[PDB]
Design a protein around this ligand. Structure first.
Ligand SMILES: Nc1ncnc2c1ncn2[C@@H]1O[C@H](COP(=O)(O)OP(=O)(O)OP(=O)(O)O)[C@@H](O)[C@H]1O
Ligand SMILES: Nc1ncnc2c1ncn2[C@@H]1O[C@H](COP(=O)(O)OP(=O)(O)O)[C@@H](O)[C@H]1O
Ligand SMILES: [Mg+2]
Ligand SMILES: [Mg+2]
Lengths: 588, 811
């Protein structure tokens, strides 16, 4: 597109939105300013600050009650008669009022300098009539670190940064860079962050306010501060425990936030040539600017290259590959949709006959004091119950599709679920990653059934400690871990409270897979590969650098089982390991 | 005054019914005999007409209630009926003692004299009393709002003066390394619990500040704190009165928190008081040279300074200052400094509402807890907000996410108005709420409690999310809270017991079978520890009936079994027993010693045509399940007899109620309410959008009858059973009843406290729809399907065939 229509065709989209000129010139008075926002982002502050800058008056009404509707009608009438502005917040909660709002907007001729601002989340309930009527604006997290810092510096007023002392500009630049990194990391979930936190503009406002407060506390009107006298510890602790650490759930995410803060908020006491990150491993780094002024920092921000790798964020370079490929094929599908405008039950029965050949039966293996034996007994019992229910349902579906059986309510619901291809609610007993399809769920079920058959045959003949277990094929793996701990404690007459875990690559656990790392003689090393398969993990319970890694139940990293400890290599860095999101998975 | 001018027809009706009641009292004083009183015909019709006219007068007189509320700020927290009773009984005075619990934080009653014309002081619900320095005189005949404002101001001044005297006394204690337990105990008995804890905090803060002003002084401070903790433990290890035991427990908790903080400070090297390692901790400062007695104490945090509200809180419960609680205090304090409301969130049972309440009590501020539901409208929210604005208290809205998204967005405007008013106050200040200007006190605070993803609850709008500082809290310090609470109750191996009981619950939560009625979290742990303390005190009393050493392991295992065994299915009993035997090698177990209740249960079962068992007979499982239900009535509040239909869980609690009546001599009354036969609106009550009048639902009306106790309901034993299936549509309105608050909040704003003789029970069948916030607050009694064997039903049918003839010796 650059070589077809000029290199500056999409350059204005990376810049912050200039709402003042667009509102003052482009928008007709009878056209409402529709301002859609993605969830987690609010656009009310933009209009409030715009009206403050333009020295106008706005009646902000929160839509959602009858007196709110009456106040909105009165304010709209008064603004049409006089010429002020009217803002209605959260209008997506009343399409049945938005319709006649649109009708009364087109039925009236307003004053010249009158604009109506409608703020709503991106929802299908918004009337298409109002969407065609108004001027649509979408509000999204800015794309790219450069655009994020540009938006931050445009949001922060100049008079706030330029106040004494002179280190406030550098501190604000550091804060903007930190906010840009930790807001850009949300896109590459779950590697960047284990959850989708709402690191919005309110956190940035609170961080700027606390930076101003602590700098004013430290400096009694002095023109400059030595870099050793800045409250670095106060800023780090307060932003890790109150502002940005408020929404942090996991200890691993808290550790990542602490690593980022301790790496970014010392700068070797404002020393020159401070490396912000490592863009490319081969002879490429991002350097802290040496300037002292806000204008110099803005000029440095605008001089950032248009290219951007995920390694700017501390993530591995291949973190954006799958998402970027999916976005490309989505664009292709969108274009195919654009140029598009310019029995079944026999196959269902064939699929139902195809699936159940991978499932045959299951034993049951009932009075023993061995914790491992009772754990495997209850696991085998649950698996046998699930297998019996699934096989009976499959046979009933085969009969009602071709045979002598009528369709009941439950059978019809199962038919609908199986035709749509999603998992029925009855079969979903154990954990499933983010709603996997029935095609993969049947294969996972077959693997679990085969593993439980192997366990039952081993228990039919201690003879149970020597088996190798796949951690991803169990209904509950934390129960297996606690059963192993109980077994070793009862066998060696120890105390359950004073037992720790050691990892070697005397219990064998299989199926554990790394994420962006490799193992060699029980020494971790960073790798550019997406995942590496650990051949066999050995667990030894004993009474009494090194990194701590999570062992997540699936690729979504929504369930935590236990934490491992692995020896790091002689050349790597635990901070790099925490920043790149190295974790361990048990299934894939 | 000027009653006759505003309501002429109402005053005419009042005069008519006054003449009718004068005739009634004349004719009842003419003849004192009840038969002679009943001799007059038409007395029932006259009473009906009088009641109807009284109801009409009360209904049409309600417009003056808001005007009366406008004068005294605390009047917003009481209902129409009891506010009218307060206004009518203004000269009665002695009747108002039962209505101060809603007006004040901990003032359950006030102290008067024989002349009933001067207020000597105030008293809490636990017998703690505050003697006023200068009593307020009603002999001047002021108005009710005037002398209530005077008594509130005098209470605050008296609390400040007592705190100043107490902190001077503690300062003269702390100058010596060795301390006298007799003098310490006399000081503890001299000063109230809140002031004692405050004085200890101020003394420790001043000592650490002087040490950091300057190694050796910090070591001296830590040594003094350790010596004080040793004296505390030695004094708790022996027999104590209940109130003094609670004061000693609060002191133990705060002193062990201070010891932990000082040890953390001395582990690193701190040289100046401006270091953030010391500024991040909660600090207290007292200035004796300050002229204003109210502003003598300043409470500080990281760049956030607060004054003490000096609101009387009675005794209450002090939390354990875990590091998570410290982080929560820091976050909420920063939010309050930035004039933003706080909003902790997370799974239920992590201690959010209690953390907010503990912070509000630490700052000495009135806190109100509302379990808001879908019926909390904009008008109700505005009413409680203007009440909070006038009184200058805190709000602790629990379960904010179930608030009808459009109404949530509407409430966001009022919240923003409050924030703007507070920021204007931070630099005759008012804000517009419900189209009215209301005075806003600087002591404002609005707090939000959320459990995202609970039962598909609604989500906040972004303009409301930006007004609240979020705080994630998911894993509380279970080991620390268990250790501190056990050491506070008094246990030689307290640390060992906590380190054995916390990983036991961690193992038991993920080893047992996955059932929908299982809790193994912080609420269950706290219930187990409280039961352990109570049973340890009971065992000590039983032994001393005949110092010494006691089997603390046996006591803890007995409490664990007593609280956790009944909720288990038949499969999980051997698993939990093996887990207990693995955690505690010399564990052992015992039960029984309930011969009187057992034999009376046998008598009632034989009377009502049941089958009995001695423990191993045909009825033994049902009998021991009844005994387990009795134990959980003893040690719990909310009960849930879970089990399949046909497990005898109705006859079990019926025969238990009858047997308990036969033992204690206290008559038992049972109310059976079906929550699904009627709608939620009819069950709890309606709020009319036209005129803000609140009618009574079934459960609310039953609770009001029990509270009012016209026919002597506090003396009896009232049991409310919800015979129906459970779902978070209606049961989430009871999560404050089953909490530490023990009260029910209505949309009209009034608070219905729960009397100690009422247990709220359920007779549910399945738990496939209730949430963890409901399952956590109740103690399960799992009635398995094998509890009621079929031969028991056969014998019951045969007995009912042999007796009770069908056409009800006879043929
Ligand atoms: N201990 C007992 N001995 C003999 N018969 C009993 C006993 N307990 C209950 N029954 C019989 O069981 C019948 C049903 O028991 P109950 O009324 O307690 O119901 P339930 O288990 O609470 O069931 P639901 O949940 O369906 O209301 C009673 O009518 C009674 O005849
Ligand atoms: N630090 C603590 N010290 C003492 N008790 C605590 C502490 N934290 C939590 N608890 C107890 O755990 C329970 C948690 O309830 P909570 O989660 O506050 O209710 P809600 O879910 O309505 O906020 C409370 O009853 C409280 O007594
Ligand atoms: Mg709560
Ligand atoms: Mg029943």
């Amino acid at each position: 597109v650059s070589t077809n229509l000029g290199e500056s065709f999409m350059s204005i989209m990376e810049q912050p939105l200039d709402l003042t000129h667009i509102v003052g010139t482009e928008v007709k008075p009878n056209t409402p300013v529709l301002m859609c926002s993605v969830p987690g982002y609010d656009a009310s502050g933009h209009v409030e600050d715009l009206a403050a800058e333009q020295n106008t008056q706005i009646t902000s009404i929160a839509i959602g009650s009858a007196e709110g509707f009456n106040q909105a009608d009165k304010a709209i009438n008064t603004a049409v008669k006089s010429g002020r502005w009217v803002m209605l917040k959260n209008v997506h909660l009343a399409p049945g009022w938005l319709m006649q709002l649109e009708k009364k907007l087109h039925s009236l001729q307003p004053h010249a300098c009158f604009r109506l601002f409608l703020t709503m989340e991106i929802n299908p309930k918004v009337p298409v009539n109002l969407l065609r009527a108004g001027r649509i604006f979408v509000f999204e997290p800015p794309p790219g670190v450069k655009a994020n810092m540009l938006r931050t510096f445009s949001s922060i007023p100049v008079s706030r940064i330029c106040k004494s002392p002179n280190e406030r500009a550098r501190l604000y630049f550091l804060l903007a860079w930190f906010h840009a990194i930790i807001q850009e990391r949300l896109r590459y979930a779950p590697l960047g962050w284990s959850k989708k936190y709402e690191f919005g503009e309110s956190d940035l406002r609170s961080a700027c306010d606390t930076v101003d407060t602590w700098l004013d506390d430290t400096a009694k009107g002095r023109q400059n501060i030595s870099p050793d006298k800045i409250p670095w510890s106060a800023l780090k602790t307060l932003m890790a425990q109150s502002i940005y650490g408020g929404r942090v759930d996991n200890e691993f995410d808290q550790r990542l936030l602490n690593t980022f803060l301790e790496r970014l908020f010392t700068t070797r006491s404002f020393d020159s040539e401070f490396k912000l990150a490592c863009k490319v491993d081969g002879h490429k780094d991002i350097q802290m600017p040496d300037g002292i002024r806000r204008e110099e920092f803005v000029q440095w921000v605008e001089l950032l290259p248009d290219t951007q790798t995920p390694s700017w964020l501390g993530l591995p370079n291949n973190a954006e590959r799958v998402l970027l490929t999916t976005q490309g094929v989505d664009m292709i599908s969108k274009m195919l949709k654009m140029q598009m405008l310019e029995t079944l039950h026999t196959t269902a029965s064939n699929w139902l006959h195809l699936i159940p050949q991978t499932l045959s039966h299951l034993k049951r293996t009932e009075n023993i004091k061995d914790p491992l034996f009772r754990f495997f007994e209850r696991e085998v019992k649950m698996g046998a119950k699930l297998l019996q229910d699934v096989r009976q349902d499959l046979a009933d579906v085969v009969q009602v599709c071709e045979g002598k059986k009528k369709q009941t309510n439950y059978l019809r619901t199962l038919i609908n679920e199986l035709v749509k291809g999603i998992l029925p609610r009855s079969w979903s007993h154990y954990t499933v990653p983010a709603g996997m399809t029935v095609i993969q769920w049947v294969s996972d079920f077959s693997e679990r059934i085969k593993q439980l058959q192997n366990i039952s045959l081993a228990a039919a003949s201690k003879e149970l400690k020597n088996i190798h277990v796949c951690l991803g094929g169990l209904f509950v793996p934390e129960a297996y871990i606690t059963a192993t701990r109980q077994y070793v404690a009862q066998a060696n007459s120890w105390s359950l409270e004073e037992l720790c875990l050691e990892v070697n690559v005397s219990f064998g656990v299989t199926g554990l897979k790394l994420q962006g790392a490799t193992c060699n003689n029980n020494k971790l090393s960073l790798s550019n590969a997406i995942s590496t398969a650990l051949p066999l993990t050995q667990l030894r319970w004993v009474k009494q650098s090194v990194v701590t890694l999570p062992v997540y139940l699936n690729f979504t990293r929504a369930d935590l089982i236990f934490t491992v400890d692995f020896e790091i290599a002689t050349k790597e860095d635990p901070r790099s390991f925490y920043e790149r999101g190295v974790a361990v998975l048990c299934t894939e | 005054a000027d009653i006759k001018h505003l309501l002429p027809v109402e005053t005419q009706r009042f005069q008519s019914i006054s003449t009718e009641f004068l005739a009634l009292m004349k004719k009842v004083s003419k003849s004192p005999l009840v038969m002679d009183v009943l001799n007059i015909q038409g007395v029932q019709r006259s009473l009906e007409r009088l009641a109807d006219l009284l109801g009409k007068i009360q209904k049409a007189l309600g417009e003056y209630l808001e005007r009366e509320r406008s004068s005294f700020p605390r009047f917003y927290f009481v209902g129409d009926e009891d506010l009218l009773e307060i206004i009518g009984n203004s000269k009665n005075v002695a009747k108002l003692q039962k209505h101060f619990k809603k007006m004040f934080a901990g003032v359950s009653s006030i102290i008067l004299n024989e002349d009933n014309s001067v207020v000597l002081g105030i008293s809490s619900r636990e017998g703690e009393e505050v003697m006023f320095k200068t009593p307020v005189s009603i002999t001047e005949h002021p108005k009710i709002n005037e002398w209530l404002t005077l008594v509130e101001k005098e209470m605050r001044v008296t609390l400040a003066k007592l705190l100043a005297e107490s902190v001077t006394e503690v300062e003269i204690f702390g100058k010596a390394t060795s301390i006298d337990p007799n003098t310490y105990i006399t000081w503890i008995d001299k000063y109230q619990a809140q002031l004692v804890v405050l004085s200890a905090q101020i003394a420790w803060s001043e000592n650490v500040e002087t040490a950091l002003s300057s190694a050796a002084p910090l070591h001296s401070v830590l040594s003094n704190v350790e010596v004080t903790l040793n004296v505390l433990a030695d004094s708790v290890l022996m027999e104590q009165p209940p109130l003094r035991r609670r004061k000693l427990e609060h002191l133990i908790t705060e002193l062990v928190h201070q010891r932990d903080v000082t040890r953390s400070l001395i582990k690193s090297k701190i040289d100046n008081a401006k270091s953030f390692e010391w500024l991040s901790q909660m600090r207290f400062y007292f200035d004796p040279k300050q002229t204003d007695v109210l502003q003598q104490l300043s409470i500080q945090m990281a760049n956030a300074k607060f004054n003490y509200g000096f609101e009387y809180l009675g005794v209450q419960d002090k939390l354990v200052q875990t590091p998570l609680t410290d982080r929560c205090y820091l976050t909420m304090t920063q939010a309050l400094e930035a004039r933003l409301g706080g909003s902790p969130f997370g799974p239920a049972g992590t201690g959010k509402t209690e953390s907010v309440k503990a912070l509000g009590h630490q700052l000495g501020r009135f806190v109100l807890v509302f379990n808001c539901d879908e019926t909390f409208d904009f008008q109700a929210m505005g009413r409680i907000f203007v009440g909070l604005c006038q009184v200058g208290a805190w709000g602790c809205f629990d379960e904010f996410n179930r608030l009808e998204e459009r109404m949530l967005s509407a409430v966001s405007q009022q919240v923003q108005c409050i924030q703007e008013a507070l920021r204007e106050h931070s630099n005759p200040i008012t804000c517009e709420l419900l189209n009215k200007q209301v005075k806003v006190s600087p002591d404002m605070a609005i707090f939000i409690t959320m459990n995202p993803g609970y039962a598909g609850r609604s989500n906040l709008p972004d303009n409301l999310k930006k007004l609240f500082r979020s705080l994630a809290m998911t894993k509380p310090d279970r080991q620390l809270i268990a250790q501190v609470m056990l050491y506070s109750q008094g246990f030689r191996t307290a640390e060992v017991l906590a380190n054995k009981i916390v990983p036991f619950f961690k193992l038991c939560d993920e080893q047992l079978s996955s059932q929908s009625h299982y809790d193994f979290g912080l609420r269950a742990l706290k219930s187990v520890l409280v039961s352990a303390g109570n049973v340890k005190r009971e065992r000590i009393q039983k032994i001393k009936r005949e110092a010494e050493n006691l089997p603390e392991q046996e006591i803890l295992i007995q409490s664990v079994c007593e609280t956790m065994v009944p909720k288990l299915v038949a499969e999980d009993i051997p698993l939990l027993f093996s887990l207990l035997s693995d955690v505690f090698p010399g564990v052992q177990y015992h039960r029984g010693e309930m011969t009187a209740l057992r034999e009376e249960l046998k008598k009632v079962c034989q009377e009502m045509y049941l089958t009995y068992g001695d423990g191993e007979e045909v009825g033994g499982m049902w009998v021991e399940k009844v005994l387990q239900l009795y134990q959980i009535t003893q040690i719990n509040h909310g009960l849930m007899m879970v089990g399949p239909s046909g497990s005898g869980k109705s006859m079990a609690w019926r025969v238990l109620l009858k047997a308990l009546e036969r033992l204690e001599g206290v008559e038992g009354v049972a109310h059976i309410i079906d929550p699904k036969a009627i709608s939620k609106d009819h069950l709890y009550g309606t709020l009319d959008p036209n005129t803000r009048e609140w009618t009574d639902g079934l459960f609310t009306h039953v609770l009001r009858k029990i509270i009012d106790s016209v026919r002597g309901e506090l003396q009896k034993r009232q049991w409310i059973v919800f015979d129906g299936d459970v779902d978070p549509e209606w049961v989430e309105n009871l999560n404050s009843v089953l909490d530490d608050n023990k009260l029910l909040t209505l949309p009209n704003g009034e608070r219905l406290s729960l009397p100690p003789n009422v247990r709220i029970m359920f007779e549910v069948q399945d738990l496939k729809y209730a949430t963890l916030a409901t399952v956590s607050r109740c103690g399960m009694v799992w009635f398995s399907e094998d509890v009621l064997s079929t031969d028991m039903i056969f014998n019951n049918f045969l007995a009912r065939l042999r007796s009770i003839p069908l056409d009800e010796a006879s043929p």
